[PDB]
Amino acid sequence: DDEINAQSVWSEEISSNYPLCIKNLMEGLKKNHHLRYYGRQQLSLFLKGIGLSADEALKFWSEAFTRNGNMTMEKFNKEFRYSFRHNYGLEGNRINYKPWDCHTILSKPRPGRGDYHGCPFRDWSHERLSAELRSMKLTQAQIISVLDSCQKGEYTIACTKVFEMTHNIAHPNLYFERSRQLQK
Template structure:
């Protein structure tokens, strides 16, 4: 990670500029519904820890996102412990790392009520097209780029599809990937790190 500190206040801006599709989906759903199911909170929460959101800011962030629909009492009793737990401050005190693409693709397959997982792997083609075109204005529904992405998904090359979205949304050419050696996306946190680096260049 880039080592920079992210506050609860900053998350929205970082999300719009630097979140990969899986995390944009979770964040946007949380913002809209003031709610995420367990594996969604876990996937997004560990990712946020990885981008530099410290524990005290994570508590502020989740409290704010749940909003007035939840009492302080319920938040403190049912959610605060889990946030502290994922930062290694409760229970076995394991400092859980953020999930890699491989883990997100293969573990805990999402049901219909869930928002976790990888959009390339877990969305229907129609949902994927709607999600990508509404989230990223530079990816038009009927563009060649969209066709490219759907072709990669069809052949189960989800990393390739995700890398293509990174390239298009960062104005870099096809095949450049997200690293110095043109790597594909293999970890959501690497997407963020590279995206922040490119912003500075």
């Protein structure tokens, strides 16, 4: 828990390593104090994969869902705690919940209104992406190249370009591990 814990996953240092899909999910969670089912699975299994323990996950999710008075601790416990415990096997299930790879993510139903799951390289407008990429200090030529991949449907190539441009088998957890190792 020294490195990855319920508090450090909200740090700039740790979150700087998240790919765009995980950034989007974290932002939706931060703003709305909730995620719908598919996003609740994509993010929770990603965080399990980077080493967030069962206890730290329950802290993370309960604090995020109850933040800013969004719901009571009792409503979280009655309506969501089981679901997060289930993802960790804490009620004894033996289902093989592994983090979702990019192909799995892309194959989930496309996000509609109020959804944050999926792959932003596919799901965001080019204007939405460009603004997101300018905030990551990419220049126009860089953005044009990323968007060219997106228009071709090559979402994981777009994501790989973003990784290369922001640093000095496609899987969000690999992006994270690859990025985090470059901080060490």
